Amino acid sequence: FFELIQGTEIDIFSYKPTLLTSKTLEKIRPVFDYRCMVSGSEQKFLIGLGKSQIYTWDGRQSDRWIKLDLKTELPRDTLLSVEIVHELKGEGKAQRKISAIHILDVLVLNGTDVREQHFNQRIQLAEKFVKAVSKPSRPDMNPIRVKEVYRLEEMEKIFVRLEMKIIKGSSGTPKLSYTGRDDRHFVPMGLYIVRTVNEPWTMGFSKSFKKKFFYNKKTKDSTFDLPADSIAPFHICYYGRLFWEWGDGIRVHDSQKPQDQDKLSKEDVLSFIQMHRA
Amino acid sequence: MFYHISLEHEILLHPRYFGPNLLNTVKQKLFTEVEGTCTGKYGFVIAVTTIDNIGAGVIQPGRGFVLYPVKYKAIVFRPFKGEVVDAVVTQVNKVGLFTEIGPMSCFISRHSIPSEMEFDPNSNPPCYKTMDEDIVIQQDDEIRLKIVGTRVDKNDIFAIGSLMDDYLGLV
Amino acid sequence: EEDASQLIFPKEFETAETLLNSEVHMLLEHRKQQNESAEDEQELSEVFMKTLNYTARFSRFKNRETIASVRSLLLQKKLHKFELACLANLCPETAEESKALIPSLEGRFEDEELQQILDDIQTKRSFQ
Amino acid sequence: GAIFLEGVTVKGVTQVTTQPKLGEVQQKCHQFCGWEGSGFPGAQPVSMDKQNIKLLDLKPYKVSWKADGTRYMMLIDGTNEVFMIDRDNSVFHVSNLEFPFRKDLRMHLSNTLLDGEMIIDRVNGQAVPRYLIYDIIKFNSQPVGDCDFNVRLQCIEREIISPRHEKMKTGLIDKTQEPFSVRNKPFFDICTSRKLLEMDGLIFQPTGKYKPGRCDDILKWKPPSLNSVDFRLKITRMGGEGLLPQNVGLLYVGGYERPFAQIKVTKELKQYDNKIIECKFENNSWVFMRQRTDKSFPNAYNTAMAVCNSISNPVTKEMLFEFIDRCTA
């Protein structure tokens, strides 16, 4: 890990997400600077030393690297930001849940550093990597996936994939479930909001040109092309991240009752986003 | 069943470990010695709730260390023959079923699992499922099992459960 | 020699007083909070962690006032401690299931009174 | 021990594991020092104690400011012929560093051996490596080490520096191309240490010929604050019949078969198990300042002890000062 980080400060890996609350909602402005993804476990770092020599770490300097107890393989010199997600198949007694590695972001891929590339661009390299390490002849192996990344101005598309499903062991009580690109779902814990544009830049929408543009708040310059210094590298994306937790009392699907009035609903976050798209 | 009982255990204090505070040393010694243990008569010793009584310290003749009989409220657990208990599945095997009840490993053999719940390695988790694909017992599930018998080995109990009678399987 | 289906317990487990799963969760999280303070004391057993997360997963009564209400409503019922705790932990919904998971409840209570008590359990279950 | 200088990587410097070349480089150093045993020929200084400091009055001394650095003898044999030697005997080839002969600038130096340290420096907030030449053993096979420390000090100036400066004046040498800066540590007569005081201490250098090996008359002074020893940290539960099997942090030193000392094991100390731990001394206790990633083994035992001989019978920041000022009269 110290070799792969090349003298980057270790404290960067210890930063906790800012909780999204009515007091922190203003931080998601401007809306176009952000991406979002549905979380199904706590975030961890993962290092690949080759084959089944895969280890995880929870970002605290006190914590040991733990060997990953999953039947999966990764190239040496691989450093990922991940979560572990169990994918339930079916419902109730017939329900079958399989844990899967879900990549949230990437730093190093088989000795290629990608940390300074744009979040979507880093994810583009990450998406190809999951196919590269894929093993479809080996249904006994634990799957690696990339998270579905949404534009923050399209968060409405996430709630259409939230369903109330009967999980094995929930005493028959339906649980909130996020359904992926396949016939698998997981119980969501919340939603990460990641900044992809670096200061002093920000993304506007031009009503005259019907296109997004980058605006430099210091120079007052505007461009329709991606400025190289507008790119948020991994450390800015990781440090600047918000987390909207989806615990009890939070309404994100219409079948949930009762709502806690001190907690942001889907309707509050979507209304705020709609007011700040324009 | 998760039990709240009172237990008696004797602590041996060498005079090197007296200190200015003597009784806190005995409390830390009891929290070290019996927490996390398992005995055949009293089961899984989970924790010590409240150290009730500290006995009189009998200096053993010829020995140096003092001996404290100690009564203490304790949370324990004991597995029982025929008790229907909730459990977490850890592994589905073609021979049996590794589940957990607390720290206890429980092994449910397939020969005492009915003919509906067949084994499948061809699913990406190897699991227990029927031909209707309705009851799917796989890893990290919440199930219920009837404990037939327990075997204690090396100062710890493991158990054997079953699913033969009614209303057993997935919650 | 022992049999939990007919309350056949050893003589050591005669004064055995039961506990609920949320009671075990609350008291062991209090022990974990005692371990968080009061330093120069190491981490507890692997048994402690496994029991604590095990009863955290299967916890049904999210309030201690819920614990006290279930304990007050069941303790005034002519049950053994074992039958009381196994009912309040497994939480069945039909009185046939109440007699099937616990075969020592055969004829202790009337099955309509038993279904009243099970509906009181499902009334006092803190849902998720 | 392929880390050349820790805190930076440097262009062209490379460990030498080639069997024919290494045996040569080492052999030629032993040769040039007239050195006896195995390993590093370089003169080794010793720590000032209340007994040593009496020597500053027995003969003439020069003094300079130690900085923590790494000890490297530089062997200049030819054209790309420059090499560097470790406290370890590790050998490194240096590439674009060139030493002109003072008479003929077209020629290069051969059969020259230098003593000095590699130090990292600060101007721009970024690391600039420097080699400081603090002594010279051989020049053209000329045995300048048997000459007098001012003679050797001057030699280094006109033979190894002025020439590299002239060729830089002309653009035959773009300072920029060379892996590191090259400089001579300035030394001062004894009487000037009062005006002076990453500089961690003092060095007291005698006027006599260079000697390889342990030099009891070359004195390194460190303020007793910075005294530190590197132990390997081993913590084990210790209550076999004892009531409390509290795990206890034991400290280990090289050469000693059993435990040297004990440290009270902190909640944070634990993850350092098997790894070198660096300790200071304060309260009749040891303390953990940092971790070192550059060694898999502790200090030599007799090193730890000569650390202690230093801490308990210390030469104080003030004791040294009175001793110098009195003799400056």
Curated annotation (Swiss-Prot), chain A:
Keywords: Acetylation, Methyltransferase, mRNA capping, mRNA processing, Nucleus, Phosphoprotein, S-adenosyl-L-methionine, Transferase. GO terms for biological process: 7-methylguanosine mRNA capping; methylation; mRNA processing. One of its GO terms (molecular function) is nucleic acid binding. Coiled coil: none annotated. Residues 170-278 are annotated as: Interaction with POLR2A. Residues 195-229 form the WW domain. It is found in: Nucleus. Induction: By interferons alpha and beta, and by Vaccinia virus infection. GO terms for cellular component: cytoplasm; intracellular membrane-bounded organelle; nucleoplasm; nucleus. It comes from the Eukaryota. S-adenosyl-L-methionine-dependent methyltransferase that mediates mRNA cap1 2'-O-ribose methylation to the 5'-cap structure of mRNAs. Methylates the ribose of the first nucleotide of a m(7)GpppG-capped mRNA and small nuclear RNA (snRNA) to produce m(7)GpppRm (cap1). Displays a preference for cap0 transcripts. Cap1 modification is linked to higher levels of translation. May be involved in the interferon response pathway. Interacts with POLR2A (via C-terminus). This is Cap-specific mRNA (nucleoside-2'-O-)-methyltransferase 1. The chain holds residues 558 to 835 of 835 of the full protein.
Curated annotation (Swiss-Prot), chain D:
The active site is at K66. Changing K295A: Loss of GTase activity. Changing E6A: No effect on GTase activity. It comes from Homo sapiens (Human). It catalyses: a 5'-end triphospho-ribonucleoside in mRNA + H2O = a 5'-end diphospho-ribonucleoside in mRNA + phosphate + H(+); a 5'-end diphospho-ribonucleoside in mRNA + GTP + H(+) = a 5'-end (5'-triphosphoguanosine)-ribonucleoside in mRNA + diphosphate. GO terms for molecular function: ATP binding; GTP binding; inorganic triphosphate phosphatase activity; mRNA 5'-triphosphate monophosphatase activity; mRNA guanylyltransferase activity; phosphoprotein phosphatase activity; polynucleotide 5'-phosphatase activity; RNA guanylyltransferase activity. GTP binds at R71, R87, D115, G116, E117, K220, W221, K222, R290, Q291, R292, T293, D294, K295. Isoform 2 to isoform 4 lack mRNA 5'-guanylyltransferase activity due to disruptions of the GTase domain. Keywords: GTP-binding, Host-virus interaction, Hydrolase, mRNA capping, mRNA processing, Multifunctional enzyme, Nucleotide-binding, Nucleotidyltransferase, Nucleus, Protein phosphatase, Transferase. The gene is RNGTT. Interacts with POLR2A (via C-terminus); this enhances guanylyltransferase activity. Binds (via GTase domain) to the elongating phosphorylated form of RNA polymerase II; can form direct interactions with the phosphorylated POLR2A C-terminal domain and indirect interactions via bound RNA. Interacts with SUPT5H and RNMT. Interacts with HIV-1 Tat. Residues 102-158 are annotated as: Interaction with POLR2A. Bifunctional mRNA-capping enzyme exhibiting RNA 5'-triphosphate monophosphatase activity in the N-terminal part and mRNA guanylyltransferase activity in the C-terminal part. Catalyzes the first two steps of cap formation: by removing the gamma-phosphate from the 5'-triphosphate end of nascent mRNA to yield a diphosphate end, and by transferring the GMP moiety of GTP to the 5'-diphosphate terminus of RNA via a covalent enzyme-GMP reaction intermediate. Residues 1-329 are annotated as: GTase. The chain holds residues 229 to 567 of 597 of the full protein. GO terms for biological process: 7-methylguanosine mRNA capping; RNA processing. Isoform 1 and isoform 4 (at a lesser extent) are expressed in cerebrum, cerebellum, thyroid, lung, heart, liver, kidney, spleen, large intestine, testis, skin and muscle. It is found in: Nucleus. Changing R292A: Loss of GTase activity. In the N-terminal section; belongs to the non-receptor class of the protein-tyrosine phosphatase family. One of its GO terms (cellular component) is nucleoplasm. This is mRNA-capping enzyme. Its EC number is 3.6.1.74, 2.7.7.50. Changing E117A: Loss of GTase activity.
